[PDB]
C-alpha cells in the first residue's frame, strides 16, 4: 500500500494542514452576487464570514463540499 510512502504521506498531511485550517475557507467561485467558498467545516448556517478583503458575507447554503 503506502508503507514506504510514509514520507509522501507526511507531505500530503502537510498540504492538508496548509489548506485545511479550521474557521478558514477558500473562494472557489465568486459569481455576480454569491460566492462559493471551499471549507468552513466549522461554520454554522447564517454565520458571518470575513473575506479578508473587507467584504462581509452571510453563509446561507451549506452544501457538502462548498459553503454557498
Amino acid at each position: 500500500a503506502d508503507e514506504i510512502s510514509k514520507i509522501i504521506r507526511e507531505r500530503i498531511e502537510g498540504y492538508n494542514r496548509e489548506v485545511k485550517v479550521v474557521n478558514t475557507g477558500t473562494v472557489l467561485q465568486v459569481g455576480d452576487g454569491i460566492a462559493r467558498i471551499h471549507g468552513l467545516d466549522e461554520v454554522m448556517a447564517g454565520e458571518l464570514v470575513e473575506f479578508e478583503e473587507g467584504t462581509i458575507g452571510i453563509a446561507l447554503n451549506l452544501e457538502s463540499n462548498n459553503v454557498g
Partner: protein, 179 residues
C-alpha cells in the same frame, strides 16, 4: 452507463489493447487501496490544493508502487479533468468492467461456514454452466444469519440469487400462512 463506468471502461479498454490486463487489474487493486484511507482521498480532492502539487505527489505515488504507465496515465487524466472526486467509484467499477471484458464472472458464495476449495470449484462449475464465463471467480463471505446451506450472488452485481438457507423456512412459512 455511469461516468465512473465510462472511465473504468476506458481503462479496461487500454488494458485490453495492451497485453497487461491482469497487471492492470492488480494495479487498480493497489490504487483503490491507496485511494481508500481517507486523507489520501481528501488530498487528491479539495480543489484548493494546487494542481502542480497534486500531480507531483501523484508522480511520487506512481513511482513508489511501480504502476503500469497507462493506469498512471489514467489517474493523471483524472486529475486533469475535474472528475478526480469520482476516483474511488471509478476504481470500484473497474472490477465490473474488467470482469466483463476478460470474460470472467464473479459469484459471491455466502454460506454459514467457510467452504472447501474443491467444492467451491464445483460451485464455480455450476455457475459457469449457467453463466458461461471462462475463469469464474468466487469470493466467499462467511455469514451468521443463514442456517444450513449457502447463497450465491452471481450475476451482474448481486442481480441473480439462489439460496438454500433460512430462506427455506421463510418460503415454507410464507406458504404456511397462505392468506
Amino acid at each position: 452507463d455511469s461516468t465512473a463506468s465510462r472511465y473504468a471502461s476506458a481503462l479496461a479498454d487500454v488494458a485490453d489493447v495492451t497485453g497487461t490486463l491482469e497487471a492492470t487489474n492488480s494495479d487498480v487493486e493497489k490504487l483503490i487501496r491507496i485511494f481508500s484511507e481517507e486523507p489520501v482521498y481528501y488530498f487528491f480532492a479539495n480543489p484548493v490544493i494546487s494542481i502542480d502539487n497534486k500531480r507531483s505527489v501523484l508522480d511520487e505515488i506512481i513511482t513508489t508502487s511501480g504502476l503500469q504507465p497507462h493506469t498512471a496515465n489514467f489517474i493523471n487524466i483524472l486529475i486533469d479533468s475535474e472528475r478526480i472526486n469520482l476516483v474511488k467509484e471509478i476504481l470500484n467499477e473497474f472490477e465490473d468492467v474488467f470482469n466483463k471484458i476478460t470474460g470472467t464472472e464473479v459469484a459471491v458464495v455466502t454460506s454459514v461456514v467457510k467452504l472447501e476449495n474443491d467444492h467451491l470449484a464445483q460451485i464455480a462449475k455450476g455457475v459457469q454452466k449457467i453463466t458461461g464465463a471462462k475463469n469464474v471467480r468466487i469470493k466467499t463471505v462467511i455469514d451468521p444469519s443463514l442456517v444450513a446451506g449457502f447463497t450465491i450472488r452471481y450475476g451482474n452485481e448481486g442481480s441473480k440469487l439462489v439460496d438454500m438457507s433460512v430462506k427455506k423456512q421463510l418460503e415454507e412459512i410464507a406458504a404456511q400462512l397462505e392468506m
